[PDB]
Amino acid sequence: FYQWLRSIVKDFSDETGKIDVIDKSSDTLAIVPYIGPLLNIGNDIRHGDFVGAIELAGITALLEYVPEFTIPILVGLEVIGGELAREQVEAIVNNALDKRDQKWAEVYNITKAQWWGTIHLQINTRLAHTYKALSRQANAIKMNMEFQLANYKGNIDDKAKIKNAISETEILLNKSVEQAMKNTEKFMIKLSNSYLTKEMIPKVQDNLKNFDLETKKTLDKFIKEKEDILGTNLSSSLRRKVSIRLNKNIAFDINDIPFSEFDDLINQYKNEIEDYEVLNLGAEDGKIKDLSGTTSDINIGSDIELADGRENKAIKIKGSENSTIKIAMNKYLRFSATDNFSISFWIKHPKPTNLLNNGIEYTLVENFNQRGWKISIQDSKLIWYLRDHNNSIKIVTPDYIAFNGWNLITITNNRSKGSIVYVNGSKIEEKDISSIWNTEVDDPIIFRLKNNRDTQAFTLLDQFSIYRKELNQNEVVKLYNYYFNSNYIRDIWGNPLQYNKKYYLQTQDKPGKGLIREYWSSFGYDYVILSDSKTITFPNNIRYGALYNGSKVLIKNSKKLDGLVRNKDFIQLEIDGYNMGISADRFNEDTNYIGTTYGTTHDLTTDFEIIQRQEKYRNYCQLKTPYNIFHKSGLMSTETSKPTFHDYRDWVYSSAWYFQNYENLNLRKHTKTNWYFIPKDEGWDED
Amino acid sequence: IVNKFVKREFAPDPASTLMHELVHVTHNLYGISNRNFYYNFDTGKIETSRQQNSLIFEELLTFGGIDS
Amino acid sequence: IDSPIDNKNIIEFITFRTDTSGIQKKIKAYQIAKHIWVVPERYYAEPLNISDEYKIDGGIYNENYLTTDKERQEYLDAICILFKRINNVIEGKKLLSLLSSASPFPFKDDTNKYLLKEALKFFTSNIILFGPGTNISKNQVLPLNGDDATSGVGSVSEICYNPFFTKKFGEYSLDPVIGLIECLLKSLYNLYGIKVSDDIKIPYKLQRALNTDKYSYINLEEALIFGGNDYKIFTEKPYWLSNDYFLKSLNTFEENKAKYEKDLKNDPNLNNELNQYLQQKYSFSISKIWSLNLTAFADIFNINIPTSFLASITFWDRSQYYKINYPNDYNIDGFVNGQWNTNLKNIEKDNNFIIFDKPKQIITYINDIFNLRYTSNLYEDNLDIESNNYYLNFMFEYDKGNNFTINQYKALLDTLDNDFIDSLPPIQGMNAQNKLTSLPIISKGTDTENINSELLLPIHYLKSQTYNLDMYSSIKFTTNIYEVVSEKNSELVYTFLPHINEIMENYSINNTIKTEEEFYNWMENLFINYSIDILEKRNSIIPGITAVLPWIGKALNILNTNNDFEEELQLSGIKGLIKEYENFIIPDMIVPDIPLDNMPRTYDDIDKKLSEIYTKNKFLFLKGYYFIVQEWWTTYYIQFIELKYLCSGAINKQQQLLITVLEKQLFYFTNNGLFPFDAMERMINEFNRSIDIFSRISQQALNNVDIFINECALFIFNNEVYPLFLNNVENNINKANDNVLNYINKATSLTEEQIKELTVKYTFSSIAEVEFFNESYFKKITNMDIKNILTNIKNINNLILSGSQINDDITIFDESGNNLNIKFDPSIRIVDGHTNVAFKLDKSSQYINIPTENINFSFMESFSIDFWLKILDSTESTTLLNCIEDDIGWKLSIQNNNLLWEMKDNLGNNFTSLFTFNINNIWHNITLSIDRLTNTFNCFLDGKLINTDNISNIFSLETNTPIEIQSDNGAILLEAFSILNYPLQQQEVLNRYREAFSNNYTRNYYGDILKYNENYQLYNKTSPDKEVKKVFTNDKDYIAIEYNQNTNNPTFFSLIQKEQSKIYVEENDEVYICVQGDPLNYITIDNNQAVLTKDINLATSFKLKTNLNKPNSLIFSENSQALRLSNRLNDENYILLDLVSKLDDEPLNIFYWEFI
C-alpha cells in the first residue's frame, strides 16, 4: 500500500508533465499532447494527433470561433478654415500629425480589445475545461485509493498511517495537476498572443493606411494654401515632415499586453526557487543568521567563527567539538515521507595537511537519529546519506572537494523518482529513493565535524539553504548562475579578486610556473618570464603542480580604489614593486614581449585590462593588453623560446593575434591565455 | 508553503468589495462613466456561449488587474 | 625546384632496397628540412600495380601517376606547403626539430653511424619521404629494419605519403597535415626505437557485422597516435593495461641514456659532433613522446577531427577521394575557403584513378512474403579481428600501477631547445652502415562476404534516402519504406519527415510554383517545415534522459514499430537500441594476501604495511572500474557512436533531398524561359545562399541527437555494466575486509589500537568507499566527439564593435573574433557610457563603416541588432543606421523623437515601423531581431518586447555596400552595437539586458552612472515637474516639494560618504546626502523628518537599493525604512522616513528618487 501509492504518484507526475517542444524559432511551443484525448479539440482537423494539429492551424484548431473581425470605415481627418497665423497653422499641422498617430494607436487598441473579448476569453474557458478534466482525473484516483484503504484486509487498526499517506498523496497529485496546468496555460497564452500580433493587426493596417493617405492629401492641400503665411522655409519643413511621417506604419505597442513573457521571466527566480526556501544559513553584518527569516532558534557554538568567503563572510566550523551549530527543527524543516526537498550549500574544504584522517568518514551536517539524512566528508569525497527504518542511499561525489575550492553542492530529492547530486551545477549521480519512506526525526539539524581525528581541521560553509521542492536541472543551473550575477573576477579558490592583495600568478597552461623577471642589459629590458617548475607532494603520495611559485604580483588601480575587480576594469599589475606593461615604441616589434618599469630605456603602457570572455564562474581571467599606436591589442599569453644566446625560457607577450581571433579558436588554445591569480590562502599550504 | 491546503478557494474581503464600488462612485461624481464601451456576450452562431450579461469596459477598468 | 643541378639539398643516391626489376636504381632527393628528405617518385620497392586479388578496399592503384616532371614539381610544392604549414605553429616546428636530431644510436666499433644512403659519400637522413606506393590512399611508414626499430637502437624509416587526395567523413575535407603529422609521429617512434612489434594490440571496436561477435584489435602504437577520446580512457592516473612495453621501452631508454652519458659524451674523435644531437635526443623523455597524439595536433592547427574513433570512423562509408590543388586550394593557413567550403573536385576520372572498393559484408535484405530484395553495402576499417580473449584473461598488476607511464602533458612537445637544435650544423662525411632487414612487402587480405538479413538494417534505410538518377526527372517523396526498397519507380525516395512528405504530396513542377514571390515563399515553406520536423524533441520519463528525439526510429529502423518511438523506447528500454553483447566480461579482481614481514619498528610496522595495502586495494579496484569503462567504450559506446553517424547521414540525405528538389525548380525556369535575366539571377543567387541555411538547422538537429545519444550511452553503463561491477567489489571487499582482520590478530595484547584505529582506518566500510562513478566524466569523453559534421557556423555574434582610445586618437575594431575591417574617421570621440565605452557621433561627416563581406541578409537568414543609444542634444530627425544600396536594404533613424525602422527588398516590398515611445535623452537598450523563420520582426526596448510585427512579405535585401553609422543631423551616443547571426528572443534579450547592470552601479535619471561629490537635482519620480528644494522659511529647516513656485531657485544634492576615496556609487553602500550652499548642510533624520542639520557627525547613513524594474531610481533606505514623500498638507510634500510598502513585489513609486 506504500509501493502502489508511490507508483501512483510517480506515474501521475511523470505522465501529466509530458510536453512536446517544437522548435520553430521565436515560437517554440511546448505543446502538452494529452489534451488531444483529454479534450475533444484537434480530432476534427487531424484525428488522433494534437501536436501535429497545432502546426496545421495554431488557433483555428484550438478555438471554436474565429471571429473574422471588422472595423469602421475610418474617414480621414480635416482642419479648420479661417484667417489663421503662421505660428498657429504650424501648430495645426503638428496637431494633425499627432491626431493621426493617436488614431492609429486607438484603432490598434480597438482590435486588441476585440481580441481580448473574443479570442482570449475562449483561451481562459479552455484552461478552465482543462482544469476540470485534470481535477476529475485526480478525484477518480482518490476514489480508488480510498476504496483500497476501505479494503485493508491485511491488518487491523493500522489504517491511520495509510490514511495520512493517502492525504499526502492527494496533495502531491494536486501539485502535479497545477504543474500540468502551468504548462497548458504557458503554451495557450503564447498561441493567443501570436494570433493577435500576426493575423489581426495586418487586417487593420490597410484601412489605417487609407486613412493616413487621406490625411496626407488633406494636409498637403492645407499647405499649398496658407503657404504665403508660413514662409518658404517653414513651408518646406512642414511639407517634409508631413511627407515622411504620413507615409509610414505606426508600430503596435504590446508592452502592455495582458499576458507577456517579460512578466513571467522578470521574477522567474523568485517564483521558482526562492519562493520555496525554508532555510538559508548565512552571515550578514558579521552575525550568522537565517537569511530567509523562516526560523530564529539557531544556536551556534562558542568556537564557531566567520571567515572571508565567496561573496560575504563564510561559516567556519573549527571541528573542535565545541564549534557546534544546531537548528532546532520546526514545521518548515520537518520533511514527511512524500515531501520533496533540496539542500544547496557552498563548501570550501582545506587540503589535508597531515595524514591522520584518511579512511575516517566524519559528518559535516546531519539530521540523523539512526534515521534521517547526513552529509559527511570522507577522504576528499562528499557523502550524502539517507537512512529509513530499513532502506538507505549513499551517494559519493568523485573528488576535488578537499582542493580548497568553493564548490556548490546541491542535492535534490524527489521522493517519487530519485535523489540527484550536483556539484557546481553538474550532475554527479542519481539513485532510486522510491524505497525510502520516513527520514523525519525531531533532533536539530547539526552542523558539526564529529568523528574527526584532527582537532585543527576546519571547513568553510556558505549559504546552506534548504528548499521544499526538487529543483530539476534547469533550476539547479539557474541557481548556480545566480551566485555569479555580479561581474567580479574570481581567483583560483573562487573568491572575488581584490585591488590591494598580492597574488601568485600562473597560466592555465604550464602549471607550477609563476612569474619572475630577468633584466637584459644589452636590450635594457626587464622581461617577465615563467619561473622554474616545481611540484608538491600530497600526504597520499600524489604529485601536483605547486601554486605558490615565482613572485607575488599586486593588482592595483590608477587611484587605489581598494574594491573588488570587475569584468572589464583597467588594472596595473605590479610585480616585485615594478609595474608591468608592454613597450610604447617600435623597439619591441617581435611578439611584443611584456616588460616591467625596471629599466628606463624604453617607455611602457602599463594599463592592462582584466576580462573574462569565458563563463563568469571560471576561476581564471584573461589579461588584455592596451592598444598603443605601436602595438595592437592582444591577450597576455606565454611563448616558449630562446630568442638569443640567453637560455631557453618562457617569455610573456601580449599576443595581438589571439585577441583578434579569440572567438574562433577552440577551447584547447584558450588555455594559453588564461591566468589563475593564486592567493596565499589557509587550507592550501606547501610546507 | 507548509499549510497543507486542500483547495485554494478564497473569500473576498468586504473592505475590497466595497472599495470597488467607491471607484464607481468617483467615476460618477466626476462625470466619467460611459456605457458605450461594452462587451456584448450574446452570440448565437457558435451556439455554445456562456450567455452572460453585457460587461462594461468601465467595469473591468474599475476592477483592474489582468483584464484591465 | 625540380631541375637543380646537384650538391647541398640536391643529391642523387642509391636506393636502399631493390626495385621490382630486381636491381637497385639511382634516384635523386631534395632536403626539405634538416635530415628530412623528399623524393617525388613512386615507391621503388613496391610495384607500380598489383593484381585484383591483392587490391585493398579503398585504393587507387593507377600506374601512370607521378610519372612526369610537372607532377613531380606538383608533389614538391605540395610538400613545402605542408612543411611550412607544420612549421607555422610553434609545436609543429618543435616536432620537426626533434625529428632532425632524432638520429638512432650509432653502431659500435669506432662509433659507425646507423643506416643511411650511399652516394656514387653519406648524407644524414632521419626520414625519407617517398611518393605513394602501389596503394596511393595508404600512407604507411615502412622502417627499413624492423628488428632494430623495437630494441631501442632506432631506425630511419621510409615514408610513402601522397597529400593530394583526402576523404570527407562528412560535409568537410580532412586536413592533409593530419595524414602527414601521423606519418611523422609514426616515424618518430622508429627513430627512438619505441615500436610495439605488431604483437601488442588493444581492442578498439566491436566488429561491425551481422554474424560476428568479435572485436577489431588495434595496434598499441596506432592507439597512442590516434588519440582522440579512446586514448583518454586508458591513460588515466592509475595505469591498468600498462604492460612490459611501457616499462621495457622506458628501461631500455635509461641505460641508452646512461651509456651515452659516460661513453659517447666523453667526446671520442669518431663521433663527429653527434653529441649535441644525442644530448638533445636523450634529454627528451619518451613519456613526452607518448603524449603526442593526433588529436592534440589537430587542435593546435584548429582542425576539426572525429576524435571518437579516429582510426575507424573515416571508413564507415564508400571511399570518396577529392583532389587538392595545392597552389590554390591549400596554403600555409590550411584550406583557403575553410574546411567546409573547400569545394574540391572528386578524384573520379575515366582513364586513371580507379577506386577499387570491395564493401565488406554486402548485406541484402530479404522478405519471404513479398518479392523484395534490397542489397546494401557495409564498409569497415582494415584493423585485424580478434576474439574476446583480451578481456577474458586480463590480469591486473597489484604492484605496478600509478608509476608514470602514459601521462597526457597539456603542453605537448614543450621541453627542448628549438633554435639551439636548428643552429646546430647538420652531419656530413663520416661513414654509415647498411643492414637492410627485409620489410613486410607481401600481404593478402580477405574478400567481401554476402550474408543475408531478415530485417531492414540502418544501412538499408540510408541507401533509400539517396536519389539515384539524373537531374531531368521527377522526385517523389514517400513514407512507406516498402515502396522504396521494391524499386518499381526508381525515383521514389523514402523520407521520415511527415511534414515534408505532405508538402511534396501535392506539388507539381509545372503549376505549383509560377512566380518569383511564390518560389521564395515555397523555399521558405520548406525551411519552416523541415525545421519543425527534425528539431522537435519530447521529454521522457526514463531517468537520466532530458529529452528524446522521435525521428530517430523512422530514420535508422531502430524501435520502428506501429508504436511511437517514445512509447516503444519505454517498454523496450534503452537496451533495445543496442545489440546486446552476451559475453560481457566483469573483472574478478582477486586481492592478494598479506605477507608476514617483520621489523621491530613501532609494532611490526603494521600501520605502514596496512596503509600501502589499503591504497593498493583502492587503486586495484580503480583499475577494475577503468578496465570496465574501456570495455563499455569498445562494446557499447561503439554501437552508439555508430548511431550518431548513421543519424548524421540520414539528416544529410534528407537535406540534399530538399536541395535536389529546389535545383529541379531552377531548371524548369531556365530551360522553359519562364523568368527574365535579372529575375533569374536572383533565384540562383538566393538558392545558393539557402544551402548554408539548411545546413544551419541540420547541424542543430544533430546537436540534439549528440546529447540524446550520450544520455543513452551513459544509461547502458549506469544500470547494465556498472551494477555488475559493484557486485564483484562487494564480494572482493569482504575478502580484503576479512583478510586484514585475520592478519591483525597477533595475541600481543594491544586491543586499544586494533579495535579503534587499525580496523576502521585501513578497512573498507562499504562500496561507498570505492564507487568512482560520475556523469561529469562520461559527458567529457562523449561530448562533441563528432562535431560540426555539417557546418561550423552557429549562433554567434558576427559583430560586436568595441573601441579604445589612446592619447587623442581612437580605434574601432570587431571584438567578436571575426576581425572585420571597420573603417571610420579619427575625429570620432569615445566617452564613457552605459557600463561600456560609447562612440560620440557628433558631426554629419563622422561615420563608422562596417563591412558586410560575411553578413548575409537573404530572406532565409535571420539577424538581430543590439546597441545602447542616447541622443545627446535635442534633435528631431536624425539617422542612426544605414545599409541601403540603390534603394535596397534596411536603415534605422530618428523621426520626431520616434524610432523609424524602415527596410525594403530588391522586389519593391517596403516594410516600415515607426515606434512612438519618444526617445528623450536617455540611454535605451534598443535591440531588434528579424526572425525570418516565422517572419517576425521583434523590437525589444530595455529588455521588453514591444512590436513583434510580422515581416512576411519582405524578401532578400542583400546589398554589397557596407553598413554606415552616422548621425547626419545631431549628436548621439552609440555603444555596444552588436549584430548577431540569430534572432534574439525574449528570454535571452532579458539576460543580456540584465548583464548591463551586473556592475551594480547606481544610475542617475539620464542613465549615466551616479558619482560621489557631484551635484544633481533630486526628484521623487512621482512629481518630476517639481524639484526637491530645501525650505528655510522656518527655523526647523527641511527638504520638501513646494507647489506655490512663486520663486524658482534649484538646490543641488550630492552623495558624499565619510571616506573621500570611492568615485563610483555602487548599490548597497552607506552614503550621506549633501545640500549645496554657503552653510553646506547635510541630511539627518529627526522624528522621521528629513531636516537639514550642519556638521558631518550628526547626519544619517542611507543604504542605496536599486530595483531592476526602474533602473534610473534610488531608494534611501535606513534599516527597513526608506525615504518617502509625505501627504500634501500646506502645498509642501515634506520628506519623511517610512516603512517600505510593496506593490507587485516592488515598493511604491514614492520611495524611488531620481538625480538629474
Author numbering:
A (entry chain X): 620 to 1306
B (entry chain X): 208 to 275
C (entry chain N): 9 to 128, 139 to 1174
Q: Which sentences from the paper describe this structure?
A:
All BoNTs are naturally co-expressed with a protective partner protein (NTNH) with which they form a 300 kDa complex, to resist acidic and proteolytic attack from the digestive tract. We have previously identified a new botulinum neurotoxin serotype, BoNT/X, that has unique and therapeutically attractive properties. We present the cryo-EM structure of the BoNT/X-NTNH/X complex and the crystal structure of the isolated NTNH protein. BoNTs are 150 kDa proteins and consist of three domains: the 50 kDa catalytically active light chain (LC) and the 100 kDa heavy chain that is further divided into the translocation domain (HN) and the receptor-binding domain (HC).
We have determined the cryo-EM structure of the M-PTC/X complex comprising the BoNT/X R360A/Y363F inactive mutant holotoxin and its non-toxic interaction partner NTNH/X at a nominal resolution of 3.1 Å (using the gold-standard FSC criterion of 0.143), obtained from 432,063 particles selected from a total of 5408 recorded movies from two datasets in similar data acquisition settings, described in the “Materials and methods” section. BoNT/X and NTNH/X share a similar fold and their overall domain arrangement and molecular architecture is similar to other toxin serotypes. Similarly to the known M-PTC structures of the A and E serotypes, BoNT/X and NTNH/X form an interlocked complex that buries a large solvent-accessible area of 4778 Å2, which is significantly larger compared to BoNT/A-NTNH/A (3664 Å2) and BoNT/E-NTNH/E (3459 Å2). The main domains that are involved in this interaction are the receptor-binding domain in BoNT/X (HC/X) and the analogous domain in NTNH/X (nHC/X), together with the translocation domain and its analog (HN/X and nHN/X). LC and nLC are situated in both extremities of the complex, facing opposite directions from the interface, and are mostly solvent-exposed. Our cryo-EM map indicates that C423-C467 is the most likely natural disulfide bridge. A cluster of solvent-accessible acidic and basic residues can be found on the interface between HCN/X and nHN/X, namely D998, K1000, K1046, E1048, E1049, K1050, D1051, K1013, and D1018 in BoNT/X; and K636, E787, E789, and E793 in NTNH/X. The location of this pH-sensing cluster corresponds to a similar cluster in BoNT/A-NTNH/A, which has been demonstrated to drive the pH-mediated disassembly of the M-PTC/A13. The charge of these residues will depend on the environmental pH, which was pH 5.5 in the buffer utilized for the cryo-EM experiments. Although there is no particular sequence conservation for that region, BoNT/X in the M-PTC structure also presents a flexible linker followed by a small helical conformation leading to HC (residues 876–895). The BoNT/X-NTNH/X complex structure also provides structural information on the receptor-binding domain of BoNT/X, which revealed an unusual array of surface-accessible hydrophobic patches despite presenting the same overall fold as other BoNTs.
